[PDB]
């Protein structure tokens, strides 16, 4: 029920469960966006919804995909305060690592350390969980296309493809159908443009909702560079699908 | 029964939202009783008022 428990993160229940942590898996659907990250054979694509619900905002600034470092992108689902705050740690650990060890920080090592740091925030009771799912994408300098999703508890596992947000279940199902049916673990194109197009299609299928360039934002990690596509760059892609 | 000459809302201050909401709730369905019956929708059977005494 509740008797102390949920008011703290150093209080376990009869079950050994730490309740407050579970509330952040409910706190990351609070932006209402949904993400899709997919793998090809020379890229990883990560796509999130772009909500500009009042025209009193500038549709440009809106995004939750942040460039963390040259080779690392990241999508944030869940709150704007915790988005920036997690980006600060990520930006900083990525820079420090670069200079400590002299060499770039892999998708996995950035994913690993962010989780540990979060774990220590659950161990102590002057901190709290940052209630965001962070999905890091990079094309590795040694393991090629990669996706690591970091959950608010601080679990991390890799993926072929992944979805996040409230409407995750439908996207899970689509993506299962896709790789099962191919019997290979990746999208087969060697043109990164059609993989972005393909990612788009899946996303429309899974959600049931057709999109516009005001309702997408797209990040693309390729080997040795990262770029976020602008609105007119997305737009080009949509008119390839609609009439192939 | 215990009906009085109207108190008036000039001798009641504040609570502007309630006075509006109360007029919409009671008085307008009473004038407009034909219309509610004719459409065949309910008007609010009761309204509940709530908060401190």
């Amino acid at each position: 029920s509740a008797a102390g428990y949920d008011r703290h993160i150093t209080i376990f229940s009869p079950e050994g469960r730490l309740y407050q942590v579970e509330y952040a898996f409910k706190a990351t659907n609070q932006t209402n966006i949904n993400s899709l990250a997919v793998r090809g054979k020379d890229c990883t694509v990560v796509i999130s919804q772009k909500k500009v619900p009042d025209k009193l905002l500038d549709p440009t600034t809106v995004s939750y995909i942040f460039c963390i470092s040259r080779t690392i992108g990241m999508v944030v689902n869940g709150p704007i305060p915790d988005a920036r705050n997690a980006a600060l740690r990520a930006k900083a650990e990525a820079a420090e690592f670069r200079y400590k060890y002299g060499y770039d920080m892999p998708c996995d090592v950035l994913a690993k350390r962010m989780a540990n740091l979060s774990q220590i925030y659950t161990q102590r009771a002057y901190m709290r969980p940052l209630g965001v799912i962070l999905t890091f994408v990079s094309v590795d300098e040694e393991l090629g296309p990669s996706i690591y999703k970091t959950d608010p508890a601080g679990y991390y596992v890799g993926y072929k493809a992944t979805a996040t947000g409230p409407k995750q279940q439908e996207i899970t199902t689509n993506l299962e159908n896709h790789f099962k049916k191919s019997k290979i673990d990746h999208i087969n194109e060697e043109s990164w443009e059609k993989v972005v197009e393909f990612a788009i299609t899946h996303m429309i299928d899974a959600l049931g909702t057709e999109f516009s360039k005001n309702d997408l934002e797209v990040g693309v990690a390729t080997k040795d560079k990262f770029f976020t596509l602008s609105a007119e760059n997305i737009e080009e892609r949509l008119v390839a699908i609609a009439e192939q | 029964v215990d009906e009085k000459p109207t108190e008036t809302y000039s001798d009641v201050g504040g609570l502007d939202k309630q006075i509006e909401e109360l007029v919409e709730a009671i008085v307008l369905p009473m004038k407009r009783a034909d219309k509610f019956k004719d459409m065949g929708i309910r008007a609010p059977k009761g309204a509940l008022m709530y908060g401190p005494p």
């Binding site: - | 201050g13 504040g14 309910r42 609010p44 009761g46």
Partner: protein, 53 residues
Amino acid sequence: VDVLDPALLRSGRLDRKIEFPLPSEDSRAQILQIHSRKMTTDDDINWQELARS
């Protein structure tokens, strides 16, 4: 609000649920005035200033 019986919490027995708050700052000053018009008033009184108190 949590002593309301489940009989009336079913649609078509209440339809309007109308909240009365505790009189806000702007509302206190008006209530005070009418009370004050039963007894003598003076220029000394400023209700806005009593309402802050």
